[PDB]
Design goal:
This is part of a larger assembly, with 5 copies of chain A.
Chain A (H helix, E strand, L loop, with lengths): L8 H10 L7 H6 L8 E5 L2 E5 L3 E10 L2 E2 L7 E10 L6 E14 L5 E9 L16 E12 L8 E14 L15 E12 L1
Antiparallel strand pairs in A: 1-2, 5-6, 6-7, 7-8, 9-10
Function (chain E): Involved in a type II secretion system (T2SS, formerly general secretion pathway, GSP) for the export of proteins. This subunit forms the outer membrane channel.
Protein name (chain E): Secretin ExeD
Subcellular location (chain E): Cell outer membrane
């Protein structure tokens, strides 16, 4: 018996034996709540076998282009987002697509841009926190950049790559290069985020 | 690791920004040519440099 | 900015450091 | 009987004797909740034998490259992460991929970089702590190079 | 600062979001056509173009 797998043979067997003679379903219905994959059982004589498999694979693409027209050396604000309360008694915080920019012009072409921006969110308006107030997913970049009057440029960016690999195998048998995958319950994960401002 | 890169004038700062703008664009166009293969989804792409 | 303090001793002659161009203006 | 093993023969035997004549499964289902490996029983006449084995073996790879373009001797900030409350009455802390950098340029080539950075996390947004507020896994390095 | 007759842009936000999810069976979910029988796909897309 392993754990990397969705559910344990224990809860399954007990539930099936508790569902007999018109029994309960709470116990078993709670196991199978989040399960995702192909659980394939097989009985050849006396050896029972349970195979577990799912691959989750995900994709998201985001693109925000908040423009604004300002007088030189005045700071513009631009917000498209929202005021949510945060504890400190509470407080209002504007979290959404924000651009705060105070441009400054080189006589000729190239703009000095003092940028403080972020794309931030209160996760889910119907989700809590392990803490106490609301939390925020932010993508921020505050810098001064000096760019030519026509040109599109990089402020900043984060290219982040994550890969977690887990196996629950039987020591010697799990290492047989091909057969060994029958002993091992592998759980792999990977992610990519390429953010460019 | 930290790899600084100095821009003395604007012309070096286009080329440095253009290669990240294009390598990002070329990455979106690569993702379209898999989404096109799979059908029924959309990854939408950044135009070419200076075209808005 | 850090050099201004250092040089202020030597002067203590009139100094300021421009945080932007990171230059020292002494007279 | 030993302990390093997933479960004790005690809870197993009692559960099997408690599961007889359509009994309960709570007791036994709670033992077998986190168990992981190959528990192989064998009866040769009167001596019972229970063999326990699992090898957990793990792998993770992380790579973050947060770049930013700044004017010399201005500190840039760059964050890609998040504001979570911490007790002290609460407080907001920006924990994610942060780069705070104030570059300074040698006339010719070589940059003096004052770096304060870290990769930090609130573990799980749905997990607690043995303490009182949220906790953070951080990888930090603040230096001038 | 705007001319006495003219209608102009103050600002604006053009925001585009696309989340794609599949729960598939590892090998079978990747069969280019049949594979859609193993996969439970959830796609989402949005657009907001705001002009002031």
């Amino acid at each position: 018996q392993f754990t990397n797998a969705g559910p344990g043979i224990g809860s399954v067997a007990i539930a099936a034996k508790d569902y007999k003679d018109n029994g309960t379903t709470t116990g078993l219905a709670k196991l199978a709540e989040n399960f995702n994959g192909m659980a394939a059982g097989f009985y050849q004589g006396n050896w029972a076998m349970l195979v577990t498999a799912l691959s989750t694979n995900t994709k998201s693409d985001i693109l925000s282009t908040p423009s604004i027209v300002t007088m030189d050396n005045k700071e513009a604000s631009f917000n498209v987002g929202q005021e949510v309360p945060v504890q400190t008694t509470i407080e209002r915080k504007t979290v959404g697509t924000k651009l705060v920019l105070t441009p400054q012009i080189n006589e000729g072409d190239s703009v000095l841009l003092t940028i403080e921006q972020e794309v931030s969110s209160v996760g889910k308006q119907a989700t809590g926190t392990d803490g106490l107030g609301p939390t925020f997913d932010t993508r921020t970049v505050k810098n001064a950049v000096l760019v030519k009057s026509g040109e599109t440029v990089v402020l900043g960016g984060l290219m982040d790559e994550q890969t977690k690999e887990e196996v629950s195998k039987v020591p010697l048998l799990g290492d047989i290069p091909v057969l060994g995958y029958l002993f091992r319950s592998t759980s792999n994960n990977t992610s990519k985020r390429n953010l460019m401002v | 690791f930290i790899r600084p890169t100095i821009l003395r004038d604007a012309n070096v700062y286009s080329g440095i920004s253009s290669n990240k703008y294009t390598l990002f664009r070329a990455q979106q166009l690569d993702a379209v040519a898999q989404e096109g293969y799979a059908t029924s989804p959309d990854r939408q792409v950044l135009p070419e440099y200076g075209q808005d | 900015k850090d050099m201004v303090e250092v040089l202020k001793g030597v002067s203590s002659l009139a100094i300021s450091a421009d945080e932007t161009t990171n230059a020292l203006v002494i007279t």
